[PDB]
Design a protein around this ligand. Structure first.
Ligand SMILES: OC[C@H]1O[C@@H](O[C@H]2[C@H](O)[C@@H](O)[C@H](O)O[C@@H]2CO)[C@H](O)[C@@H](O)[C@@H]1O
Ligand SMILES: OC[C@H]1O[C@@H](O[C@H]2[C@H](O)[C@@H](O)[C@H](O)O[C@@H]2CO)[C@H](O)[C@@H](O)[C@@H]1O
Lengths: 327, 327
């Protein structure tokens, strides 16, 4: 079956160019686009084409699975929902280009009935690799830069969650409200920042990028971000951290700097995890229904595998705020 | 290829009987053993017979992966060692009979080049299922009830670790030294209890089963075990818990009962994990080299896959005690 690699080889370009032609990106010259399309035609290439087994792919290094509380709940829900339907799963990981290469090549070999895609980053190649092999998949987290109507996914209302977190800080009287945002190559990072922005504007407050710092959902990134916020805006009085681990980092940086939480700076996190429960002070945090998300991911994928559902399905789940001492 | 199921069907027995005949167990009558052997002959059954992919099988429910600190370090080491050799892994789980059935059936279908076996329990069927399909495997943890010379494994010197933990408590003057042992259907549970026993006897102390309680490496099992020890022996002055999570439970039960740690009861755990580091008081714990264990598991398996090694290899890794406040 013709591959993207074969198209690139014949056209004399690389994977990045062919991937851009497949997606209809503007980032290709007309002459090179036409060369790629000629190769596609010559090869008969089509980009967008039992084992009782699903691959749950987490597009991160495996240590993220154990460090960040989100993953455990997804895996719990996936496991239960697949068990109820007679399916099992295997868990696959990897952040790097070579890991994506090897995993995409493997999943093109008819070793699983379908794939669940979790924690993907913008421009990760695995969806393309699965589409050209005809392997069905469902996302956990809407894909950035893909038209929504073409894909099936379960996601959280992270714009709403970001609004809930920021509205809490507005409602308790704060006027210099910062965020440690998630990474902007991940849908939840984009949308929790969007919710923060929408809350500020709905309240008649300014969106000041001085008060926006970015992490990558790790603790260490939260440490660096909180330190930077204090340098830029020593008068910050509240922080919305877009994950509990980044919020835990913020609490520790705030305390090290001599600021009381919540009296000087209030903090709200996201995940409503044991990280928040056991923080000092216990951390207010947005609760998202991670187990249900996993269950629904598995349900939607099995329906595609069995033919019960033949059109894309998208499901968005609501959040709520869990109030503790920190904000 | 003939299966155990086919042998059972032809002989008119079930899987448990055929499995016992395959292993040369005494737990079969002569007449039934001969019936099974006739079926084996009639079918031509043999019990003991690329994808760049290894299955790392954890014979537990997936939530154990996230709750117990051991697993993260194994996965880290496996991932690095396989990456260095051009292999990837998938992670498979399951405690139940139906999960073992489905996973054994899948792994017999040529979807991986080899298997790593972690956290298995005595009489788990997956090794049998892999042997009849000719799928190479390496254990992490020596198998109970299998002659050692027939298998490849990496294990920890858990007899020595159990001795280190118990010798510490003897050396600090304790005379009523209990253990919350691991489960006796798992090699580490057996061997850490053996080390406890050997330490007591080497010191001229009695092995008193009154002071031996059993858990299953979960926190909840440690809670029940510590409560039982206090009921049987209110004068206990030290506890060796065979995992950090069971030791954390012991600390909390001890404190709830009005006993000071270490002043009334000293505690030593096993795993030298963040569970021990963050306990109140910080927990003395046996350190085992989990990342190295994972690396070596992967190395041994790849050598079998590639044909570099054609004989069984067994490796046993040493432990050391990490001293903190609790004991
Ligand atoms: O919440 C922090 C956690 O986010 C993960 O992204 C999730 C997100 O939480 C969820 O709302 C959305 O529906 O799905 C994405 C996964 O694709 C992220 O993967 C983690 O690194 C992070 O710890
Ligand atoms: O240490 C508690 C941990 O033990 C795991 O068993 C390991 C054992 O720690 C290790 O020394 C031995 O070499 O391998 C086995 C795994 O087969 C057990 O799987 C965990 O449930 C437990 O938390």
């Amino acid at each position: 079956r013709p591959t993207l690699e074969m198209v690139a080889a014949l056209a004399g370009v690389g994977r990045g160019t062919v991937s851009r032609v497949i997606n209809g990106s503007d980032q290709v010259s007309p002459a090179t686009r036409e060369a790629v399309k000629r190769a596609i035609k010559e090869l008969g290439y089509v980009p967008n084409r039992r084992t009782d087994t699903v691959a749950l792919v987490v597009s991160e290094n495996n240590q993220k699975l154990f460090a960040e509380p989100f993953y455990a709940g997804i895996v719990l829900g996936v496991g239960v929902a697949l068990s109820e339907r007679g399916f099992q799963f295997v868990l696959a990981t990897g952040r790097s280009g070579i890991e994506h290469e090897r995993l995409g090549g493997y999943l093109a070999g008819q070793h699983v009935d379908g794939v669940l895609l979790l924690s993907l980053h913008r421009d990760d190649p695995l969806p393309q690799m699965l589409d050209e092999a005809g392997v069905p998949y469902v996302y956990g987290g809407r894909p950035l830069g893909v038209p929504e109507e073409q894909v099936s996914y379960v996601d959280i209302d992270n714009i709403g969650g970001g609004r809930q977190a920021t509205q809490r800080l507005i409602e308790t009287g704060h006027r210099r409200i910062a965020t440690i945002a998630g990474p902007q190559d991940m849908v939840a990072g984009v949308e929790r920042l969007q919710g923060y922005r929408e809350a500020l504007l709905a309240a008649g407050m300014e969106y000041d990028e001085t008060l926006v710092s970015y992490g990558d959902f790790t603790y260490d990134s939260g440490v660096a971000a909180m330190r930077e916020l204090l340098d830029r805006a020593p008068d910050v009085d509240a922080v919305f951290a877009a994950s509990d681990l980044m919020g835990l980092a913020a609490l520790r940086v705030l305390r090290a700097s001599g600021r009381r939480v919540p009296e000087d700076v209030a903090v709200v996190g996201y995940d409503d995890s044991t990280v928040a429960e056991h923080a000092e002070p216990p951390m207010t945090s947005v609760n998202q229904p991670t187990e249900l998300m996993g269950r629904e991911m598995a349900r939607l994928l099995v329906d595609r595998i069995t033919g019960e559902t033949t059109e894309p399905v998208r499901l968005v789940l609501e959040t709520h705020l869990m109030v503790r001492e920190s904000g």
